[PDB]
Design a protein around this ligand. Structure first.
Ligand SMILES: *CCC(=O)n1c2ccccc2c2cc(C=O)ccc21
Ligand SMILES: [Zn+2]
Length: 197
């Protein structure tokens, strides 16, 4: 699909940018859970996934935090990741996300969606906001709108989520990522995938 492949080099940058996650466990009723051993997130479709951000020092004002997805295996990394024909046309859009965009940010009125005219890649970016009073990290609530097994979509192809911090003018301050598997039963899948280890 695309003419380039985005760099995935994890890079902490001058502010020590990194991502954190909750310790949800693999109970049968969790809406998302992170496998530290897989560095892979297991979640349901369109259910809320909180991701935390951490920095050490003060970043410049007007900073924006952007998410993107790319297929994991070397032979698929140029295909743009998008919702499958069925899901794209499900008319459950929230009123902001492009109906073909896989990743939504939930509960933020300053979200921004981009279809990249040269890479053709979809991405969602929001403003960077400091941790609530008392807290020490920033939580962003993401959603994934297709199952990993969607034919015509990923079709069971693993994917990475690449989160990049950028300044107001759009330049890179740090990057981090993780793989993702979307299914209806994320606790059991996480359990089983760690077993196979
Ligand atoms: C863009 C969010 C932000 O400005 N921010 C965060 C986010 C998450 C964890 C910590 C943290 C900050 C810490 C400081 C000062 O040390 C300044 C801005 C921070
Ligand atoms: Zn689908």
């Amino acid at each position: 699909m695309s003419s380039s492949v985005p760099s995935q080099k994890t890079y902490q940058g001058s502010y020590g940018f990194r991502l954190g996650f909750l310790h949800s466990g693999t109970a049968k009723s969790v809406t998302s859970t992170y496998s530290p051993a897989l560095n892979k997130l297991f979640c349901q479709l369109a259910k809320t996934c909180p991701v935390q951000l951490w920095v050490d020092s003060t970043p410049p004002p007007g900073t924006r935090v952007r998410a993107m997805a790319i297929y994991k295996q070397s032979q698929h990394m140029t295909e743009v990741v998008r919702r499958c024909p069925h899901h794209e046309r499900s008319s459950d859009s929230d009123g902001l996300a492009p109906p073909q965009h896989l990743i939504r940010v939930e509960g933020n009125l300053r979200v921004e969606y981009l279809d990249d005219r040269n890479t053709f890649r979809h991405s969602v970016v929001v403003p960077c906001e400091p941790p609530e009073v008392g807290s020490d990290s920033t939580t962003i609530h993401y959603n994934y709108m297709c199952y990993s097994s969607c034919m015509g979509g990923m079709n069971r192809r693993p994917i990475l989520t690449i989160i990049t911090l950028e300044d107001s003018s759009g330049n890179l301050l740090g990057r981090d990522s993780f793989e993702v598997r979307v299914s209806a039963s994320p606790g059991r899948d996480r359990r089983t995938e760690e077993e196979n280890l």
